[PDB]
Amino acid sequence: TLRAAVFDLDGVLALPAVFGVLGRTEEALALPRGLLNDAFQKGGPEGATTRLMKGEITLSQWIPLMEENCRKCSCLPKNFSIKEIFDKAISARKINRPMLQAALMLRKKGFTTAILTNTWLDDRAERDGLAQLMCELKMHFDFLIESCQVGMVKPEPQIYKFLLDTLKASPSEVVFLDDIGANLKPARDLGMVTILVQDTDTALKELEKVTGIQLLNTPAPLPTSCNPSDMSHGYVTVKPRVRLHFVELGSGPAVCLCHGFPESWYSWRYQIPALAQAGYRVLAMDMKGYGESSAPPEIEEYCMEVLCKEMVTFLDKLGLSQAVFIGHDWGGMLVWYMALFYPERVRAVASLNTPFIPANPNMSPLESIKANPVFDYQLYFQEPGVAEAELEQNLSRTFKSLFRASDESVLSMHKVCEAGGLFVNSPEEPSLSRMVTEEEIQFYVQQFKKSGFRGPLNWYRNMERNWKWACKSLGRKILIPALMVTAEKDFVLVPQMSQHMEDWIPHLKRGHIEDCGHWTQMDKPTEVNQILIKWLDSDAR
Amino acid sequence: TLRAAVFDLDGVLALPAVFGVLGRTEEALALPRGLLNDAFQKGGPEGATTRLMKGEITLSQWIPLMEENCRKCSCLPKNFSIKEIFDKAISARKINRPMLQAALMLRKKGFTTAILTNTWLDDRAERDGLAQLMCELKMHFDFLIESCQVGMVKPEPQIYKFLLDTLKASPSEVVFLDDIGANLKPARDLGMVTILVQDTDTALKELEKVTGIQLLNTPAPLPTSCNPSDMSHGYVTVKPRVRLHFVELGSGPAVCLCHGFPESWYSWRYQIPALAQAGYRVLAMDMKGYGESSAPPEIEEYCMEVLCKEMVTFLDKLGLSQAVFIGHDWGGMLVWYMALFYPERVRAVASLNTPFIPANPNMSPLESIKANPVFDYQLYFQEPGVAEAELEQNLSRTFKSLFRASDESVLSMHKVCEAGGLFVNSPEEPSLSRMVTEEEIQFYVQQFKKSGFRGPLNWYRNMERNWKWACKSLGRKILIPALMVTAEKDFVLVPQMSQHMEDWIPHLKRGHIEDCGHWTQMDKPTEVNQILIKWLDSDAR
C-alpha cells in the first residue's frame, strides 16, 4: 500500500524537457541527428556531464567542456553558442501545472512527496529564473533531492537507497515518476511502483489507477494558503505603547494588506503566496487591536487620524518611501484615507467591498448610520462592553456564525439593537461554513484570546472624530492609481454604495465578483487573486 | 535660553527653493518679470494657492487653477506647462546637507527640532520623489508640521501658537529659520529668535552665535545609526525549534546582512539606514545563536551546511527568490558558502575581512588552525564550557575588551591557550573604545543575557564537519558578482589572507580600508557605506 510519490523535475514537473531542446536545435540547424545529444552524454560516468550532475564542477565551468565535446562529435555553424541554447531552453521551461496539482492532491491525502532530480550548480548570470522555479516548486513538497547536492546521480543505485532513507519508507510504499526509462529501472528493480512519463494525461491516468485517488478531471483547486508557523513574522514599534505585527513574503514593490473587522493578517492567507509569486513584497498586517499587534483600551487610539499616522510611521521605520495599500472592510476605509491624506506614501490604492464615501458636513455621522437599516449592528457596537461580552462569550461560535458564504448565513444585521444582540437568533453550535476548516476557525479563536474584541470594536467608536477629520478632505480628489472591488452578495457593503466613486476618483478602475459575500478573500480567493494581480501589474509597477 | 530650533523646508532644508524656479522660468522664456510669481500668489488668502497650502484642495486640482491665474496675469508660449515646470522644480530640489547637519548637531546637544512648512497634498503621478525626500528629512526631527495637514498657513499667527504648543516651549526658548521675511515676522513679533536664510553659511554663522554651539567647520559626522525600538522587527520559523530574527528597513532589492562573532544585527547599525536610503530592502539578521534568534545547545546545529540550509528556508518563507548576501567575520564565511552551494538564491555576494579560502583536502582543519599563530584563540574556543565561562563572567568587560580600534587593543590572540584565557592580561574595568558609547555596549550586554556564548561559540566547533562539506565544492568557481573588502589593521583576518581569491572568483571586485581594525562596520562606517553602495549600484541591480 502506497504512501509516498516521487517526481522527476525535467520532463515531469517542468516542461518542455531540456533534452527536447538538444534535439530541436539539431533539427532547426540541419545538424546530424543526435550530434548535440551525444556530446551532452560523452564519457558517461567519467564525462563532464556526470561531474556537473554530481556537483564536482559548476554549470559555467561545464559550458566550455560541452563546447569541446560537440566539436569532437562533429561542421558546426558561425555564431553557435551552447550558452545561448541552454539559456533559451532553461528560460522556456515552466512548471507542468497539472503534474504539480496531482502531487498537491496526493500530499493533501496523506502522501509524503519528493522531487528527485539530476541537476547542476547554476552560476550563470541568468540563474535567478531557475532559482525562482525551484523556490516555487520545492515548497509544495516534503523533500527536494538534487544530484549536485548529494554527490550521487540517477541511475546509480545509491541515490535510490538515499531516496528510501529520506522517505523512511519501504520501496513497495513508493510511486516513482520519470521521463527516462533508464532512471526508472533501478526504482522498478528495487520494487517501487514506476510510471514512465511521456504525455502528462496518460501518466496521471496511470498514477490515479495505482494510488486509487482521483487526480484527473478534479474540480478547480483553491489557491495556495499559509501555514502561520512557516512565515516570516515582523514587528515594528510605532510608538511607546504600540507595536504592529505583520507577516512578510516575496520581493518586489511593497504591498500592504489591511484586513477588516473582526479579522487577522490570516484573512489574506490565499492572497499572500499568490501576490509574492506575482512579483510583489507582501506585508499582511495584524491591524491595531488585533492578533500580535498592540491593543490599547482607549477609544481615541482607534480613530482614522491615528491609525493612518501609525501606518505612515510603520513605513518610516521599515524604510519604505511607499507601499501599495489594499484593504477590506474597515481596512478598505483606512486605505482610502491613506490615499487622501498621504498620497506620497501610497503607490496605488485598492479596496475590497468598502466604497469611498465623502463625509456629509450637513449630517451627523450617527444620523447617517441610522438612515441605513443594514448598519444597525454598528449602533449595537457603540456602547462600551455590550458587544465585547457577546462576542467574547464563545469565540468558536462568534467566528462560525460570522464567517459564512451568502447561501449559508445565520445573521441579519438590521434590527440587532431591538433583538438585543448579534447572535440572539443564532444556534449555540453553528455548522462549519464551506469557506473554512475547523483548524482555520481555531486560529482566529487563539488570536482573539490575547486581546479580545475591545480594540477591534473601538474602530467603530470614533464616528464623530473620523467625520470631523474627513471633512478636511472635502475639496480633494483621489488622483493616484485606484481599484474598487465590489462583491455581488455583500448585504451590508452593497455594490450600489460605490456608484458615485468616480466623482472623487475620476480614473478609478473596477473589479466585480459575482456570488461573493462579505468575506471576499476566502469566499472567492481565485478571482480576488486574478483581479488584484492584473491591476497590480498594469497600475502599480 | 534656547532649547528648540525650527526650520522651514523650501529654501532652508531643501534647495534650490521652488520660488527660485518661477523666476528662472520667466528669465529663460523672456516673460515679463514676476508674471509667473504674481500668478502663484493671486487672490492672497482667498486665492487658489492658500486653499492648496491649507489642504482644501490637492496639487492636481490646483494645477489648472494656477494655469488660469497665469493667463489673466498676461502673451504665453506654444507648449507652456505649469505641470512640467513644477515637476522639474520639485525633482531638482534636494536636501541642504549642511543645514540638516546643523539640525542634527542641535538635536544631539539636547534641542527639540522641528520642520514648519507651507506645503501641499501631492497627488501627481510623480509624487514619490517628494514622498521620499520628506520620509528621509522627517526622521531626523522631533516634529513635522505641514500647513496642508494642520489647515493653517504661514504667516497667520495661529500656526505659530500651534508651533509653540507642539514644542511645549515659550517663544524665547525657540530659534526660527526661514527664507521669507514675511513668514519670519510673526515668530519675531512673538519673541522668538529669528534668522533670515539667504546663503546657508551666513545663516549657520547666525545660528552658531545665537545657540553657542559649533555647527560650521565641524569634524565629519558619523552615518545615521539605528534606535532598536524604532525598527521593524521580523521573525521567521525555519524549523520547529528554530526561529530567526531580523531588523528590516527600506524598499528595493533584498540585502541580507550577516554579522560575525560575538555580534548582533546591531553591528550593522551604521549600514542599515545608509543602504535603505540608497534604494535597498535591508534584512539585518540576528544569526542563529544570537539575540532574539533561537540558540539550540547542540554543536552540530551550527555547522555551515545547516546554517546555510536555514538561510535558504529563511528566503523561502519570506517569499524571496534571491537576496544579496553581505557578511562580516563568521557571516563572511557563511556568505561565501551561500554563493558556492546556492548561487541561484544569491543575487551578489560581499565579505568584509573574511576571505574565501578553499578547504585543504590533504590537511586536517585543526592542523591548518594550528599552523597560524593568530588563530590560537579558536583552539581555546573548542572545549565546551571553558570560553562560555570566561565570556559570560562579566558581559560589559567582554564587549569593552573586544570592541576596540587598532590603536586601542588590550587583546593579543596568539598564546591564549598557554595564557589560560582571552582576558587574563586584560583589565577588570576596560576603558570605553572611541567606536562605542556606554549605551551601545549595554545593548550587546542585554542581548547576550538571553542565550549567552554557547550557540555563538558552537560556530567554531564544527571545523571537521565544515571541512568535509567544503571539500564537495573544490571543483567549483564563484562566478556570480562578488566583492572582497579588506581591513588594513585586522590582525587576524589580514588582507594578505585574500591574495589568492581570484583563482576561485576570477571576476572578483575589491575594496580596501586603511587604518581599519577587525570591527569594520563601527570602525570605518562612512567608508564601508561608500564601498558597499557603490558596488551594489554597479553589480547588484
Ligand SMILES: OCCSc1ccc(Cl)cn1
Ligand atoms: O463592519 C464594518 C463595515 S466597513 C465600515 C467602514 C466605514 C464605516 Cl464608517 C463603517 N463601516
Ligand SMILES: OCCSc1ccc(Cl)cn1
Ligand atoms: O456572512 C455575511 C454576513 S456577516 C457580515 C459582517 C459584516 C459585514 Cl460589513 C457584512 N456581513
Ligand SMILES: OCCSc1ccc(Cl)cn1
Ligand atoms: O464620515 C465619513 C465616513 S462615511 C462612510 C464611508 C464608507 C462606509 Cl462603508 C460607511 N460610511
Ligand SMILES: OCCSc1ccc(Cl)cn1
Ligand atoms: O573569529 C572568527 C574569525 S572568521 C573565521 C572564519 C572561518 C573560520 Cl574556519 C574561522 N574563523
Ligand SMILES: OCCSc1ccc(Cl)cn1
Ligand atoms: O580589537 C581587535 C582585536 S579583537 C579580534 C577578534 C576577532 C578577530 Cl577575527 C580579530 N580581532
Ligand SMILES: OCCSc1ccc(Cl)cn1
Ligand atoms: O575548511 C575550510 C575553511 S578554511 C578558512 C577560510 C577562511 C578563514 Cl578566515 C579561515 N579558514
